[PDB]
Amino acid sequence: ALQEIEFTSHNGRDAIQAWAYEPVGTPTAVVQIIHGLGEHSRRYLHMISALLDAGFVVIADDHAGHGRTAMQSGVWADAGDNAAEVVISDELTLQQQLAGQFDDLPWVVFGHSWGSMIARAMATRPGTRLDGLALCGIVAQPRGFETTLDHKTLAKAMATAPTDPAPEALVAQMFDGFADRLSEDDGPTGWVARSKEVVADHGKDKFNNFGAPMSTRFLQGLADIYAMANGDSFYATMPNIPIVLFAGSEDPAGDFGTGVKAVAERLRRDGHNVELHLYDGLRHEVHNEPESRADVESSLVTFVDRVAN
Amino acid sequence: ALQEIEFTSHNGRDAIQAWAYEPVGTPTAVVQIIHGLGEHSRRYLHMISALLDAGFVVIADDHAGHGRTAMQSGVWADAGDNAAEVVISDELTLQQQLAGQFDDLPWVVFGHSWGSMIARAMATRPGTRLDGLALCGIVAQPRGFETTLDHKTLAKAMATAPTDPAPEALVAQMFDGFADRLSEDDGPTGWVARSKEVVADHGKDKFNNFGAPMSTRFLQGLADIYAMANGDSFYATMPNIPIVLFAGSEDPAGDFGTGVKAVAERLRRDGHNVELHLYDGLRHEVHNEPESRADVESSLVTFVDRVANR
Ligand SMILES: CCCCCCCC(O)O
Ligand SMILES: CCCCCCC(O)O
Numbered sequence: 001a002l003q004e005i006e007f008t009s010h011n012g013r014d015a016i017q018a019w020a021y022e023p024v025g026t027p028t029a030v031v032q033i034i035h036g037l038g039e040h041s042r043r044y045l046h047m048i049s050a051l052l053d054a055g056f057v058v059i060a061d062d063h064a065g066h067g068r069t070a071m072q073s074g075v076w077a078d079a080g081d082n083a084a085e086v087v088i089s090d091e092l093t094l095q096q097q098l099a100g101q102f103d104d105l106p107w108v109v110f111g112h113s114w115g116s117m118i119a120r121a122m123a124t125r126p127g128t129r130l131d132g133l134a135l136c137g138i139v140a141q142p143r144g145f146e147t148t149l150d151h152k153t154l155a156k157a158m159a160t161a162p163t164d165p166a167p168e169a170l171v172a173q174m175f176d177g178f179a180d181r182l183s184e185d186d187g188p189t190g191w192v193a194r195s196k197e198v199v200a201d202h203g204k205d206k207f208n209n210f211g212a213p214m215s216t217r218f219l220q221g222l223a224d225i226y227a228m229a230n231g232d233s234f235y236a237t238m239p240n241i242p243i244v245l246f247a248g249s250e251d252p253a254g255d256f257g258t259g260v261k262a263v264a265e266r267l268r269r270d271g272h273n274v275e276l277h278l279y280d281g282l283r284h285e286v287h288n289e290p291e292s293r294a295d296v297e298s299s300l301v302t303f304v305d306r307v308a309n
Numbered sequence: 310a311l312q313e314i315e316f317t318s319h320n321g322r323d324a325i326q327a328w329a330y331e332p333v334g335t336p337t338a339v340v341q342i343i344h345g346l347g348e349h350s351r352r353y354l355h356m357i358s359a360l361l362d363a364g365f366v367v368i369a370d371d372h373a374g375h376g377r378t379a380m381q382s383g384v385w386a387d388a389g390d391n392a393a394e395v396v397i398s399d400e401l402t403l404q405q406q407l408a409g410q411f412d413d414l415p416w417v418v419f420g421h422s423w424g425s426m427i428a429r430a431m432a433t434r435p436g437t438r439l440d441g442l443a444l445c446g447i448v449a450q451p452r453g454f455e456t457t458l459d460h461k462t463l464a465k466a467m468a469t470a471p472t473d474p475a476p477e478a479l480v481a482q483m484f485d486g487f488a489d490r491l492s493e494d495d496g497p498t499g500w501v502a503r504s505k506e507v508v509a510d511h512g513k514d515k516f517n518n519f520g521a522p523m524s525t526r527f528l529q530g531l532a533d534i535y536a537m538a539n540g541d542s543f544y545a546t547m548p549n550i551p552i553v554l555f556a557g558s559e560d561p562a563g564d565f566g567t568g569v570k571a572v573a574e575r576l577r578r579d580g581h582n583v584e585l586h587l588y589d590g591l592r593h594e595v596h597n598e599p600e601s602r603a604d605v606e607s608s609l610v611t612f613v614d615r616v617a618n619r
Contacts, residue, residue: 001514002351004380021354024510024597042311045330049358071313197334204331205310288333 005097009064010089011080017068018061018094023052029106029304030098033060034091036113036137037222038077040067040207047287050297056304057102061094063087063114065218067207076212081162083221084228087114088121095129106131106308110300112287113137113253114222117229124228124237132307133238134300136246137284140259144176145226154223157216166219174222178252191252191283198288235266242307243267244275246296248282248289275303314406318373319398320389326377327370327403332361338415338613339407339438342369343400345422345446346531347386349376349516356596356606363610366411370403372396372427374527376516385521390471392530393537396423397430404438415440417613421596422446422562423531426538433537433546441616442547443609445555446593449568452486454535463529471526479528487561500561502594511594544575552576553584553612555605557591557598584612 005018019041031051033044041060048058062069064079064086079086095107107129111119116135122128139145154170182190189210192199203210214222228234247253247260254260257278264274277299279292286292310331315324328350340360344350350369360367371378373388373395388395404416416438420428425444431437448454459482466476491499501508512519523531537543556562556569563569566587573585586608588601595601 001510002349002516004377022510022513024504025506040311045354045361046358049354052354068313195333201310201331201333207311290333 007093007097009086010093011064011086013075013080014064014069014073016061016064016090017072018059018097020098021048021052021058023055023057025055027057027102027105028055029108029308030057030059030102031108031110031304032094033058034109034111034115034118035060035063035066036115038208038210042067042207043205046293047297050301054301054304057105059094059098061090064090070209071207076209078215078218079221081217083218084121084224087118088125091118091122092125092128108132108134108304108307110134110136113139113284114225117225120229120234121225123239124234130239130241131309132241132303133243134303136287136296137251138245138247138254138260138263139226140230140263141255142177142252142259144174144178148173148176149223151223154220158220162217164216165213166216170219171214174219177255180252181250181256193283193285193289194250194281195289198285235270238267238272240272242273242303244277244299244303246277246286246299248284248286249278249280250282251284253284316402316406318389318395319402320373320395322384322389323373323378323382325370325373325399326381327406329407330357330361330367332364332366334364336364336366336411336414337617338365338417339411340365340367340613341400341403341416341418342367343418343420343424343427344369344372344375345424347517347519347521351376351516352514355602359606359610363613365613366414368403368407370399372399379518380516385518387524387527388530390526392527393430393533396427397434400427400431401434401437415616415619417441417443417616419443419445419609422448422593423534426534429538429543430534432548433543439548439550440619441551441612443553443612445596445605446560447554447556447563447569447572448535449539449572450564451561451568453483454532457485458482458532460532463532466525467529471529472524474522475525475528480523483528483531489561490559490565500592502592502598503559503590504598507594507597544579547576547581549581551582551584551612551616553586553608555586555595557593557595558587558589559591560593562593
């Protein structure tokens with residue numbers, strides 16, 4: 001069974017394109033997929049199918065500035081003012097689109113990259129429906145977000161021209177670390193996957209619209225959600241629910257396994273149960289890399305079957 | 310990769326809602342999925358994903374009066390005047406939406422039910438891309454379309470109100486035989502599949518729109534496409550390309566396997582390469598029955614891989 005859900009974004013501009021996929025038979029759980037930067041929810045076709053085969057409802061949308069939402073509105077790589085609050089609020093609104101249909105079922109959030117930061121940010125808001133947390137391509141302690149990004153220069157650019165293309169220097173500062181283990185044969189987006197096939201497909205997918213320039217205010221939104229996701233309030237208010245992490249050891253987003261380990265570690269220090277899957281020699285999109293995809297999907301299915309409150 | 314490929318129907322009314330799904334890597338074939346009556350192309354999620362894994366581009370549209378195309382036009386279970394020629398044109402147009410992109414790949418057409426009839430009607434037209442034909446839920450020699458449906462009473466209804474819902478008598482007549490092997494427990498849609506879970510999901514899916522009544526002219530369209538699919542000109546003009554058939558023994562659409570067997574034997578009689586998968590104890594949607602899904606899928610992958618060797 002398929003449902004199309006549209007709603008007005010918290011930004012008042014975008015018609016957020018959303019889908020709910022229901023399996024045949026009586027479902028046991030709801031899985032909300034939150035996609036990352038420069039991609040869309042319908043890229044998760046293999047994983048959506050696998051979660052339906054396992055008897056889960058799947059709900060996902062294309063965020064403000066992305067995929068079919070961008071393709072209908074005409075605005076890529078901008079989510080309007082307060083970018084961070086908009087995509088958080090939008091992911092909460094998506095949950096309420098199933099109110100009364102599945103209130104008895106456990107609800108697992110799966111976030112990738114930017115989706116991981118949104119998920120972590122949602123986990124700390126009262127009234128977020130969340131019985132289990134699954135993060136993929138965790139953004140934790142890469143040099144760019146930690147150190148290189150000059151927040152004064154971003155603040156000044158946010159005061160002069162918040163709707164303009166983000167200055168090139170702030171983009172390159174933000175993603176500093178992402179080319180550290182790539183040769184020239186890899187390319188500028190080689191950190192996306194060891195697999196050149198997945199990287200080329202990432203580039204061609206018209207619903208990724210790769211290259212599309214972020215707005216200043218969008219970049220401030222990346223900095224804001226990065227700070228919410230990795231701040232003391234996250235660690236201290238993360239509810240005691242099952243947590244699973246999926247990362248590639250070569251993924252720069254989690255500082256090549258080190259940043260991901262520190263997330264797990266701090267969560268464990270504060271009494272949380274964290275299941276860490278680290279795929280040795282794989283890059284960012286371990287859910288799409290052909291040597292890891294099956295393990296990410298089979299681990300997430302086992303996770304959901306137990307993380308069923 | 311995902312392409313959204315909508316185009317204006319031959320009926321001049323509807324915006325045909327279409328998608329192309331491209332796999333990771335160099336694809337080795339294109340598979341066109343053609344869905345049947347009261348269903349939609351995004352119901353093939355499992356098959357689409359299985360074909361992408363196998364390294365094939367998949368293309369499909371929601372036909373006139375169906376799925377997202379009905380949802381955006383507002384018109385359900387009607388495909389315009391000359392319904393058959395509309396849906397046949399729209400599937401040839403669907404192919405042309407990829408022109409320039411995969412011109413040296415082999416093209417398999419997979420049709421289920423109404424889609425199986427459309428696929429056979431396509432096979433007779435020149436300039437149809439078709440290197441292999443795969444048919445599921447085959448509509449061949451069931452009592453309703455063969456003898457029960459009164460073509461005089463249909464001509465009356467077509468002369469009085471082609472746009473109004475088909476009179477109850479013609480709809481009951483067309484599907485006469487579909488209840489012959491259902492207990493009271495199976496219920497009216499029981500023929501869809503042995504699995505109650507599939508039948509219940511079929512009824513619930515909003516993009517299937519369970520109880521939408523056919524127009525008289527849509528019904529004229531089913532009778533017309535049934536005769537193109539099963540008439541002498543189909544058997545006489547079918548190209549010399551691999552053919553695969555998938556049917557349930559308990560599927561009434563193919564006279565409980567008798568009609569599907571008759572399709573195989575008659576194509577063979579003219580020297581055609583035919584591969585026959587009849588699934589004992591299963592009903593219409595053998596591509597959705599839990600017990601046969603995987604086998605219909607891996608047999609389609611094997612078939613396509615075989616077509617590609619040329
Ligand atoms: C296509 C290039 C922009 C992608 C940034 C990476 C995605 C995760 O960081 O959200
Ligand atoms: C008439 C019920 C909907 C499914 C019909 C069968 C096939 O002819 O597509």
